[PDB]
Amino acid sequence: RGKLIAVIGDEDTVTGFLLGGIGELNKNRHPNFLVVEKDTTINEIEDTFRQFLNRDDIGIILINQYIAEMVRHALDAHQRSIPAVLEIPSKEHPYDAAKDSILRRAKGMF
Amino acid sequence: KIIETKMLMGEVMREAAFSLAEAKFTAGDFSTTVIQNVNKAQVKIRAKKDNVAGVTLPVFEHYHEGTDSYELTGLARGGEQLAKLKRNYAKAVELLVELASLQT
Amino acid sequence: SFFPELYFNVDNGYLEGLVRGLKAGVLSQADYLNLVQCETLEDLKLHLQSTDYGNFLANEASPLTVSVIDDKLKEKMVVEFRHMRNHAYEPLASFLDFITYSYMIDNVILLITGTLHQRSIAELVPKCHPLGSFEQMEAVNIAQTPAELYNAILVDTPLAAFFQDCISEQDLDEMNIEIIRNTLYKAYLESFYKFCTLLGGTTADAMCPILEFEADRRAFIITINSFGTELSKEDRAKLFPHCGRLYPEGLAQLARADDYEQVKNVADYYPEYKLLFEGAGSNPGDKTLEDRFFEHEVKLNKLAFLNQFHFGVFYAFVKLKEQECRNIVWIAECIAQRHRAKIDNYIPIF
């Protein structure tokens, strides 16, 4: 009931989670997810990112790292805890490690 | 504990990504149907309180609400691979929920 | 009979030579081995360029991805198909239309659902499978009105006859989308089979065995996958095609079955299938049932080229290359994801 998990990522990432049973339409026919394609621009990602951050029914957001870099300024601008944003490796992009939001919050972590 | 979980997340997501490729191999192009055919969520997250000390910390807890997900045998009827794929990501989500709670 | 082997090459002579000449270019086992011995996508391209495949990734993004290899391969065979489909006459073209129908069926499922959930046609068309095409209007600019799409389909879209099972729109809103697509596919397969039997020569004997296999394949796989879902046994039976070996007797047992073992027990009555369930060891690190079906289907599609005077060579041609595309992408995916131990999961195409 309480909170949904929003996903902003590539075609396979979103498809996988949707099969995972996560994601749904609100009463306004809005989807708590975005598929980011090669033709998707920065304003589209940022607008979606912001709407999830300002949407009180979301909370955890799952994004691809390569996207995290594309709109990275928005990831440090918001410092809260409901909107926990987790950065994941895309099907082909390589495993994340550096530029983790948390490793930045705490500079004492491997 | 945050880093140990992050490392596991890598291994778990890799397996799910491969499993998706396997489902695609059999099914072909199911991704369009899944993305368009979305209505209700089966997984939702509830807030819970963790009394770490005098300070109380907000944590997420996985809630298996139970509303049925889409059952799709339309593409090559590759139900076995899609079923394993659902489970692989479902497991990934639970780990990610734990992961978000750790960020707080 | 004396019906074939005479007029066939009068109009279809060129296409028969061309399509077999195109088949001659399909990757051999030796070529797949060269593709496996790469471990790099750039080397994969270079090795693939050794055959009729290649030179299609040129002028694309310097990074090589799976999505590019997948799309490009599909495009290659679509172009070759359209070429042969355009240089063809009604006696053969109608056969080819059925092949395209299978893809149109999936595409119209996409046109609905999206129409039902306010999506514009222009947004949906880019995700439709090629050969669907839908050059006709009225299906275009439906104004997100399900009634307008339903009427345009009845009128302009060749699949109108198939929708006779799913009608009045009420069916579109009340039926589960997957039941609608499985129902339409049944209608397609039943009509296409009958068409092949109306062409009661070599084509009927060369083509029907493959269609009959697919029909029985659907019954087996649907029954198993349907176990874990919510579906009336009778409604499940309604989806079993009648063009196969299970139709006389066998579907009744699958319709009642609630277990994998009961489905296998049915196969036990059909050695051609019993061997498949025995081969489908289903171990945690072995091949499964779907894999054995692909291997059998390809064997049949290869045997299709033992007849030089029929239309079934074109059907097998498309399906055989589709599996070849699956095989090539599989290799690219195994490289991209670095799982070399899983490389030998392609279906050899001889």
Cα B16 from Cα B88, distance rounded (Å): 5
Nearest to C117 by CA among C149, C151, C139, C144: C144
Give the DSSP H or E segment for B12.
Answer: helix B2-27
Helical ranges in chain C per DSSP H? 8-23, 29-36, 41-48, 66-86, 90-114, 121-124, 146-155, 170-174, 177-198, 202-225, 233-238, 251-256, 260-267, 271-279, 289-303, 312-336
Resolution of this entry, Å = 4.4
Cα C349 from Cα C320, distance rounded (Å): 7
Residue C45: count of CB within 10 angstroms of its CB: 21
Residues 6+ apart with CB under 8 A from A79: none
Is B79–C221 a contact, with Cβ atoms under 8 angstroms apart? yes
Query: What are the φ and ψ backbone dihedral angles of A3, each rounded to 5 degrees?
Result: -130, 145
Question: Which position has the token pair 């409604």?
Answer: C235
According to DSSP, the β-strands at A60-64 and B57-63 are unpaired
Which of B2, B30, B34 faces A102 most closely, judged by CB atoms? B2
Selected residue of B14, B20, B31, B37 to mutate for chain C interface (largest C Cβ count, 10 A):
B37
Is residue A45 within 8 Å of A72, Cβ to Cβ?
Answer: no
DSSP state of B50: E
Nearest to A62 by CA among C88, B94, C298: B94
Is residue A32 within 8 Å of A63, Cβ to Cβ?
Answer: no
- Give the pair of three-digit tokens for residue C298: 């390809």
Cα C183 from Cα B77, distance rounded (Å): 14
| B49 beta partners | B58
B30 → chain A, closest CA residue:
A15
Residue C329: count of CB within 10 angstroms of its CB: 23
Is B96–A20 a contact, with Cβ atoms under 8 angstroms apart? no
- Give the pair of three-digit tokens for residue B70: 């889409």
According to DSSP, the β-strands at B44-50 and A5-9 are unpaired
Which of B21, B29, B80 faces C129 most closely, judged by CB atoms? B29
Phi-psi region of A17 (alpha: psi -120 to 50; beta: other; left: phi over 0): alpha
Which of B20, B45, B99 faces A16 most closely, judged by CB atoms? B20
Is B74–C224 a contact, with Cβ atoms under 8 angstroms apart? no
- Give the pair of three-digit tokens for residue B99: 């992961």
Cα C89 from Cα C12, distance rounded (Å): 8
| A33 beta partners | A7
Technique of determination: cryo-EM
Whether chain C has a CB inside 8 Å of the CB on B37: the answer is: yes
| A5 beta partners | A60
* C-alpha gyration radius of chain A: 14
Cα C180 from Cα C173, distance rounded (Å): 10
Query: What are the φ and ψ backbone dihedral angles of B71, each rounded to 5 degrees?
Result: -100, 110
Distance from CA of A92 to the nearest CA of C (A): 6
Query: What are the φ and ψ backbone dihedral angles of A87, each rounded to 5 degrees?
Result: -100, 125
Is residue A24 within 8 Å of A4, Cβ to Cβ?
Answer: yes
CATH architecture classification, A1-110: 3-Layer(aba) Sandwich (3.40)
Which of A12, A23, A110 faces B17 most closely, judged by CB atoms? A12
Cα A31 from Cα C259, distance rounded (Å): 37
- Give the pair of three-digit tokens for residue C85: 């489909």
Whether chain A has a CB inside 8 Å of the CB on C120: the answer is: no
Whether chain C has a CB inside 8 Å of the CB on B8: the answer is: no
* C-alpha gyration radius of chain B: 17
- Give the pair of three-digit tokens for residue C63: 């990074």
Which of A3, A24, A96 faces B45 most closely, judged by CB atoms? A3
Question: Which position has the token pair 């990112």?
Answer: A49
Is residue A13 within 8 Å of A88, Cβ to Cβ?
Answer: yes
Q: Which chains form contacts with chain B, at 3 or more CB pairs under 8 Å?
A: A, C
- Give the pair of three-digit tokens for residue C324: 């070849």
Is residue A23 within 8 Å of A17, Cβ to Cβ?
Answer: yes
Nearest to A96 by CA among B102, B18, B3, B10: B10
Is B74–C339 a contact, with Cβ atoms under 8 angstroms apart? no
